[PDB]
Write a protein that binds this ligand. Structure first.
Ligand code: SF4
Ligand code: SF4
Lengths: 118, 114, 77, 186, 209
């Protein structure tokens, strides 16, 4: 077993597969509640399922690390947890809807303060 | 000529007064402490008098939002005087005692230059 | 109860107050317009009561009170 | 050497991966170090030793220096080899001066030549950046090498053209040397 | 064959470009526009309400994972009805890329706070509040940072004189330092450095209404 995570605070965590699996399940359900025509949904399943499908083939934690890339398991679980909070907040945010506000004319125009031909 | 816009704190003019008068409470209650803490000439009655005039400084504020900000400034300055971050110079600033009231009637202006 | 104490203390505030008209200073004297005191005067007056009674009053009391009798009601409270 | 504690790839060096051994010779070493302050003794003897190095204090103002030919110090308005003022009031020096410490007013001398009347520098606003001399098209103004120009009164620092010309006259030889050193190189 | 002219990282332009469309189609309600500035950085123009959702989306989602919030740069531009613009320039260590989020607001309406998203921002909101007066809603403590105590006005605005309105000295009558109306030994001499000849045609009609 690796002695240290190389980072302060980030401690070595056992049963990573169980934790990663459990995290992937919850986020999948969290996106399950989403509407079926949300781009955020469309991609999270394929990404998460790709991860949650890679979780199994590599019993060795180091083997899984290489297979999944993207960093070490210790951070990787945190990545998953972050996204759990994202989905719960995302459902609460309803960002799949259309534009709340149209920018006023000449808002995002650079350079500023130049007369124009109508 | 109305606009349907976000709030800041106060949703109605009466809430605005409620907030504005809350500030007036903190400032009135604070004055004695500053008279003690800050070794400056000013006395309680004068400090109280200035506090009155300095609210009167802007009586005809109308917008709910503008009056909200004025209170936001006051709550800040309250805390800066409540705790002693400020300095005797900073607190006296409200009196402007370095410059004599400049001439105002036309001749005194005329005879003293633009 | 203690209605002498409440009335006595309440009266002495406005009795011994600047910015005020002694006559017409009824217990039914509306601070705002009957008494001619500004709202700011009104705020400082209720505070002087918080001085003479050492009592934490809510801001909602401000409108719920109008008259020295009103604060007498809130003082014997 | 003790083994590491985190395996390191290249492009990095962990400065604490070395393990604190538990071998008896290793613990007794550390214990003896604490019981008799060996590490302090090493540092102690270092400072004793380093008395025996000669101090590097320059005996100022007798001994002094070194500087380099590009040193940016007192300002000076140079003059041609004939003695004529080099400045022509092109006013670039003012236009570039980051601190806006330069003020110029020029007219025609009776000969009809384009020359300054007032030429002022405030060395309480100048930053001795040297943008003025890098810009001047005739090397009229230069950051002369003098740097001991210290005054008891603030007013004495605001140089006008008369003061600047005097410095140019005073320092002309040295300024000539530097420019001969750097003109083809600057 | 132009050694003077640099050549950007094209593949970096590729990734940022496709990723930018990803963000636009994942946050439809908020992202108003996504553009790729020629300096290879990526800008994300949002409406004022989506500030936190965009930041929260970025820091959290796998593909973004933009954890560090470098700064909150404030920009002032009169002639834009709600002028005060804000810039949230973020970094992503996981993918080694930078992103910029931008929003607008006027001198009156408040603005969302990033204190609840990145703890790093806390001081920055205090800084913009001091320097422009852009309020921040839900900010824990909006105390001024830089300007001195009892300073009136927010100097970084472009409708504020460079030298300020007042300046300090010391009184002997009062053994104290007093602020006085401005008085300058030499009035700051501007220079009118305006180009008469348009030196850039490419930006002339491009970006028109
Ligand atoms: S740049 Fe040189 S020549 Fe031009 S005004 Fe300045 S000192 Fe004179
Ligand atoms: S050295 Fe720099 S700051 Fe000083 S006068 Fe020359 S250009 Fe101005």
């Amino acid at each position: 077993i690796k002695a240290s995570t190389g980072l302060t605070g980030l401690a070595v965590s056992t049963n990573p597969h169980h934790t990663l699996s459990a995290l992937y399940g919850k986020i999948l359900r969290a996106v399950s509640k989403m509407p079926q025509d949300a781009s955020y949904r469309k991609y999270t399943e394929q990404l998460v399922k790709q991860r949650a499908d890679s979780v199994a083939q590599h019993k060795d934690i180091t083997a899984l690390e290489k297979a999944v890339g993207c960093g070490q398991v210790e951070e990787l679980i945190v990545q998953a947890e972050n996204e759990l909070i994202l989905a719960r907040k995302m459902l609460g945010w309803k960002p799949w809807e259309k534009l709340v506000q149209a920018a006023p004319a000449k808002q995002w125009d650079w350079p500023p303060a130049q007369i124009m031909e109508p | 000529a109305v606009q349907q816009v976000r709030p800041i704190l106060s949703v109605d003019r009466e809430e605005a007064r409620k907030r504005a008068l809350n500030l007036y409470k903190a400032w009135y209650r604070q004055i004695p402490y500053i008279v003690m803490d800050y070794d400056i000439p000013m006395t309680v009655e004068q400090c109280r008098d200035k506090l009155r005039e300095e609210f009167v400084k802007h009586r005809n504020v109308t917008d709910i939002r503008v009056i909200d900000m004025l209170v936001i400034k006051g709550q800040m300055e309250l805390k800066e005087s409540v705790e002693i971050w400020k300095q005797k110079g900073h607190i006296m600033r409200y009196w402007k005692e370095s410059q004599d009231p400049k001439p105002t009637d036309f001749l005194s202006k005329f005879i003293q230059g633009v | 109860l203690s209605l002498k104490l409440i009335n006595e203390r309440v009266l002495l505030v406005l009795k011994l107050y600047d910015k005020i008209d002694p006559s017409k200073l009824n217990v039914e004297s509306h601070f705002i317009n009957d008494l001619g005191l500004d709202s700011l005067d009104h705020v400082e007056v209720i505070m002087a009561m918080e001085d003479e009674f050492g009592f934490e009053i809510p801001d909602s009391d401000a409108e719920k009170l109008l008259k020295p009798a009103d604060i007498i009601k809130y003082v014997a409270d | 050497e003790p083994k590491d504690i985190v395996e390191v790839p290249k492009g990095y060096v962990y400065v604490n991966n070395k393990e604190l051994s538990m071998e008896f010779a290793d613990i007794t070493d550390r214990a003896a170090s604490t019981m008799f302050f060996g590490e302090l003794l090493r540092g102690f003897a270092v400072t004793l030793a380093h008395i025996f190095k000669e101090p590097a204090t320059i005996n100022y103002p007798f001994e002094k220096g070194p500087l380099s030919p590009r040193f940016r110090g007192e300002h000076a308005l140079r003059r041609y080899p004939s003695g004529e003022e080099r400045c022509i009031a092109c006013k670039l020096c003012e236009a570039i001066c980051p601190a806006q410490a330069i003020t110029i007013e020029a007219e025609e001398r009776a000969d009809g030549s384009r020359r300054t009347t007032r030429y002022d520098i405030d060395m309480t606003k100048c930053i001795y950046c040297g943008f003025c001399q890098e810009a001047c098209p005739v090397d009229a103004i230069v950051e002369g090498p003098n740097f001991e120009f210290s005054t008891e009164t603030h007013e004495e620092l605001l140089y006008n053209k008369e003061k600047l010309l005097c410095n140019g006259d005073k320092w002309e030889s040295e300024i000539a040397s530097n420019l001969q050193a750097d003109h083809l190189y600057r | 064959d132009k050694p003077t002219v640099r050549q950007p990282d094209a593949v970096a332009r590729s990734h940022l470009s496709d990723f930018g469309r990803y963000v636009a189609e994942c946050l439809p309600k908020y992202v108003q526009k996504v553009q790729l500035t020629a300096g290879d950085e990526l800008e994300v123009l949002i409406a004022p309400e989506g500030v936190v959702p965009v930041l929260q989306f970025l820091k959290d989602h796998h593909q973004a994972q933009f954890t560090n919030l470098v700064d909150i740069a404030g920009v002032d531009v009169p002639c834009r009805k709600n002028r005060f613009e804000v810039v949230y320039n973020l970094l992503s260590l996981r993918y080694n890329s930078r992103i910029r989020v931008k929003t607008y607001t006027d001198e009156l309406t408040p603005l969302d706070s990033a204190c609840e998203v990145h703890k790093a921002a806390n001081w920055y909101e205090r800084e913009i509040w001091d320097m422009y007066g852009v309020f921040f809603a839900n900010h824990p403590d909006l105390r001024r940072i830089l300007t001195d105590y009892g300073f009136e006005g927010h100097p970084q605005r472009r409708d504020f004189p460079l030298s300020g309105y007042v300046e300090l000295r010391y009184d002997d009558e009062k053994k104290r330092v007093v602020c006085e109306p401005l008085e300058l030994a030499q009035e700051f001499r501007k220079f009118d450095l305006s180009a008469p000849w348009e030196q850039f045609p490419n930006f002339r009609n491009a970006n028109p209404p």
